A paper describes a structure:
Sirtuins are protein deacetylases and hydrolyze one NAD+ for each Lys residue they deacetylate, which links their activity to cellular energy levels. The conserved Sirtuin catalytic core comprises a Rossmann fold domain and a Zn2+-binding domain. Here, we show that resveratrol can directly activate the deacetylase activity of [name] and inhibit the enzyme’s desuccinylase function as well as Sirt3-dependent deacetylation.
To rationalize the mechanism of [name] activation in the FdL assay, we solved a crystal structure of [name] in complex with FdL1 substrate peptide and resveratrol. Data quality was impaired by significant twinning (twin fraction 47%), and the density for resveratrol further weakened by its low occupancy (∼50%), likely due to its low solubility. Due to limited space resulting from this orientation only one peptide binding cleft is occupied by FdL1-peptide. The acetyl-Lys points toward the catalytic His158, and the FdL1 N-terminus occupies the same peptide binding channel as observed in other Sirtuin/peptide complexes. The C-terminal FdL1 fluorophore is packed with one surface on top of a hydrophobic patch formed by Tyr255 and Pro256 in the β7/α11 loop, and its edge is approached by Arg71.
Numbering used by the authors: 35 to 301
Write the structure that this text describes.
Amino acid sequence: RPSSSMADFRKFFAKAKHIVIISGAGVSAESGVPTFRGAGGYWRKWQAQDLATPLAFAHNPSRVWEFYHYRREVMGSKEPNAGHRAIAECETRLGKQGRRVVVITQNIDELHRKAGTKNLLEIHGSLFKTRCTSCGVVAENYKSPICPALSGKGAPEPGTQDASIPVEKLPRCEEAGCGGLLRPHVVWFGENLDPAILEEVDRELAHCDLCLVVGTSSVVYPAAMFAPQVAARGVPVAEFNTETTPATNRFRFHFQGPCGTTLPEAL
Ligand SMILES: [Zn+2]
């Protein structure tokens, strides 16, 4: 069934008054941005599903920041693409017209935010946000590097050497009289989700009259808990992906290829 109609699609898109846009790894990967919870591209000597766990920060905090210094870093040179932008501009327009567009995004790169998207829901946090592991405070952090110690430390290559920066040298909360060890405020495997962020997610799913999916779909994680709700209520689901045919899900629309291509036109 999954219609291939940018025709009718453009019909509902003109009709619908509260669009919710679930964003995917793909959207970020079309930029220049490094996926790791991905097929290949390990980061040095370890699995990245394996560095991004709470016990990693427990056994070597140093070499995890090592992993996220890099992350934070690499994106100095990466930009929002035509997808990030189509979506942004579409938000603005109908914004003053008189309609809500929302963007739900598992990604942590903040590329949507650079593109000018105001309604963002990053359901894994940002790697430009820190959490003090002591007085769980949260904070925009953009400093390059994050800690003098980490300057030059983080090398992509393998057989790179460790770093083993004494905890005390790692990122430390500036909160007056705290100084606990800073971690990345980014949802880890085994880790759960901002329940607030979820009750808004779920909120914008009951009230949405148009739903979009881009990058990584309803068949593949992290993206699923959101596909099911839309279909039952009686609401159309356009899926925009780069995954040719391999799949386990279908709905009112599917399109193909980069969302650089498609989206600009669509929205
Ligand atoms: Zn603190």
